[PDB]
Amino acid sequence: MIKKPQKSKPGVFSFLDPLAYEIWMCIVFAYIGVSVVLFLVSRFSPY
Amino acid sequence: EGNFKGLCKQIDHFPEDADYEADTAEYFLRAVRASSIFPILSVILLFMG
Amino acid sequence: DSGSTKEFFRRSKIAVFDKMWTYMRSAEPSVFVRTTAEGVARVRKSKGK
Numbered sequence: 365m366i367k368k369p370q371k372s373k374p375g376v377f378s379f380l381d382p383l384a385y386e387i388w389m390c391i392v393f394a395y396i397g398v399s400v401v402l403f404l405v406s407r408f409s410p411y
Numbered sequence: 412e413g414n415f416k417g418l419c420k421q422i423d424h425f426p427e428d429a430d431y432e433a434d435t436a437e438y439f440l441r442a443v444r445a446s447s448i449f450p451i452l453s454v455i456l457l458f459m460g
Numbered sequence: 461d462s463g464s465t466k467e468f469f470r471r472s473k474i475a476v477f478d479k480m481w482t483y484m485r486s487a488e489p490s491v492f493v494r495t496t497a498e499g500v501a502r503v504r505k506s507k508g509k
């Protein structure tokens with residue numbers, strides 16, 4: 365028997381609760397590559 | 412509105428049970444709280460301006 | 461005090477329980493209490509200690 369805990373609330377970055385940390389990491393990696401593919405196709409010298 | 416009206420207490424943070432020091436986000440939030448740090452600084456640049 | 465559990469760790473051969481009993485014989489002052497709610501409100505005022 366020990367004392368009760370309190371209802372220690374969520375913190376500042378509580379908003380990213382729906383996703384795993386590793387999921388967010390995949391998103392940013394996806395985020396960059398989509399841009400540079402568009403940077404490949406656009407500005408390709410369409411002569 | 413009491414048996415002595417206009418008796419002005421000074422108040423700070425108080426140590427309750429186990430204090431949640433591991434909540435350093437909270438203890439820092441306590442540390443910012445008992446201070447006018449931003450409302451005093453809101454005077455400062457307004458004075459400096 | 462005068463508990464079988466207090467006697468159990470005296471006789472307990474599990475090393476952590478020995479190590480607890482090693483502490484409990486060396487716990488200064490008395491972690492041991494005589495009656496039931498004696499230990500209860502002790503924890504209640506221990507603030508998790």
Ligand SMILES: N[C@@H](CCC(=O)O)C(=O)O
Nearest residue numbers: 462463464465466467468
């Ligand atoms: N029923 C137990 C309570 C105390 C203990 O568990 O040590 C006894 O009479 O010994």
